[PDB]
């Protein structure tokens, strides 16, 4: 699934992860460390919304 950062528009794609910040591809948003933040703007996880119909 994909989640959008409501502040800056960055999309966290679980298939892509965030390798440069220690997140391997396939890591679910709920599995992200509590201290993980948007890599673009710094926003906490609370500011993300799941993109699901």
For the window 5-44, what string marks contact with Fe ion as x by the rule CB under 5 A?
Answer: x-xx-x---------------------------x-xx-x-
Cα(44)–Cα(52) distance, integer angstroms: 20
Residue with the two structure tokens 């390798």: 19
Q: Name the β-bridge partners of 49.
A: 4
Q: How far is the CB of 5 from Fe ion (least distance, A)?
A: 3
Q: How far is the CB of 17 from Fe ion (least distance, A)?
A: 16
Residue 6 contacts residue 48 (beta carbons within 8 Å): yes
Q: Which residues bind Fe ion (CB under 5 A)?
A: 5, 7-8, 10, 38, 40-41, 43
């Amino acid at each position: 699934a994909k989640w959008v950062c409501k502040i800056c528009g960055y999309i966290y794609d679980e298939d892509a992860g965030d390798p440069d910040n220690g997140i391997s591809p396939g890591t679910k948003f709920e599995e992200l460390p509590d201290d993980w933040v948007c890599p673009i703007c710094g926003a906490p996880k609370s500011e993300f919304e799941k993109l699901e119909d």
